């Protein structure tokens, strides 16, 4: 929702793709 | 509208607030204590410190690549250092707010996951999942093409060359000598596995926060 919250969720998605 | 909703938003705002406070502490090259955070950031939510500090620490690690490590246990003193022992943070020239170590680690980790190199297409695929796009200036990370093909190449973290015998042109990315010296494929892959496997901290409800008190 917040700009910072989205930045955290997007970094989380980046780490998930590499780990896969 | 709801009391529990406004409480979660208050805690979420403190994570944002503490995260930027820790970032300012890193750029100022100073230590931080628990008492300093309890008094200057989360004065009215002190007993929620483990949740707030834990969420803010992990965000600094994932986004900016800064580690918040306790120096002295009895003093609750923490130091702010780049992840994986890298000597680069991108705080140079006109970029004096946001470290670029986090994105470099994500690129280095993408390449190591692929083997001896990753093509340009799958670097842009991985970056696109984080809202990072060729030719677009991200609000935090900046423009990625320049970061990938100029900054990090000239810093010797990355190599950007054309695939041997291409028709038509085709490019890929590799670890430069500085990346191989400061860290390794094994240490970076382990970092990615640790980040991805960390159990999320839940925001305490009002009732659970009342048990803490």
Numbering used by the authors:
A (entry chain B): 347 to 366
B (entry chain A): 100 to 312
Text from the published report:
pmcRecently, Griffith-Jones and colleagues investigated the structural basis of RAD18 regulation by MAGEA4 through NMR titration and AlphaFold2 modeling to elucidate the interaction between the RAD6-binding domain (R6BD) of RAD18 and the MAGE homology domain (MHD) of MAGEA4. In our effort to develop peptide inhibitors targeting the RAD18-binding interface of the MHD of MAGEA4, we determined the crystal structure of the MAGEA4 MHD/RAD18 R6BD complex at 2.58 Å resolution (statistics shown in Table EV1).
Each unit cell contains two protomers of the MAGEA4 MHD-RAD18 R6BD complex, with similar conformations. Protomer 1 (with the MAGEA4 MHD in chain A and the RAD18 R6BD in chain B) has slightly better quality and is used for analysis here. The electron density of the RAD18 R6BD (chain B) is very well defined in the map except for the sidechains of K347 and E349 located at N-terminal end of the R6BD helix (omit map shown in Fig. EV1). We found that the RAD18 R6BD forms a single α-helix and binds to a surface valley of the MAGEA4 MHD formed by helices α1, α3, α4, α5, and α8. Numerous interactions between the hydrophobic residues of the MAGEA4 MHD (M161, I162, F163, I205, M212, V239, V291, and V294) and RAD18 R6BD (A365, I364, Y361, A357, L353, and V354) are observed. Surprisingly, we found that the RAD18 R6BD peptide binds in the opposite orientation to the AlphaFold2 model presented by Griffith-Jones and colleagues (compare Fig. 1A with Griffith-Jones et al). Therefore, although the reported NMR perturbation and mutagenesis data appeared to be supporting the AlphaFold model, the interacting pairs of MAGEA4 and RAD18 residues are completely scrambled in the AlphaFold2 model in comparison with the experimental structure due to the flipped helix orientation of the RAD18 R6BD. The binding mode of a small peptide might be affected by crystal packing, and the MAGEA4-RAD18 R6BD complex might exist in solution with an alternative conformation or with multiple conformations. Our structural elucidation of the MAGEA4 MHD-RAD18 R6BD complex has provided molecular evidence to clarify confusions caused by the AlphaFold2 modeling and accelerate the development of MAGEA4-RAD18 antagonists to dismantle a key enabling feature of cancer cells.
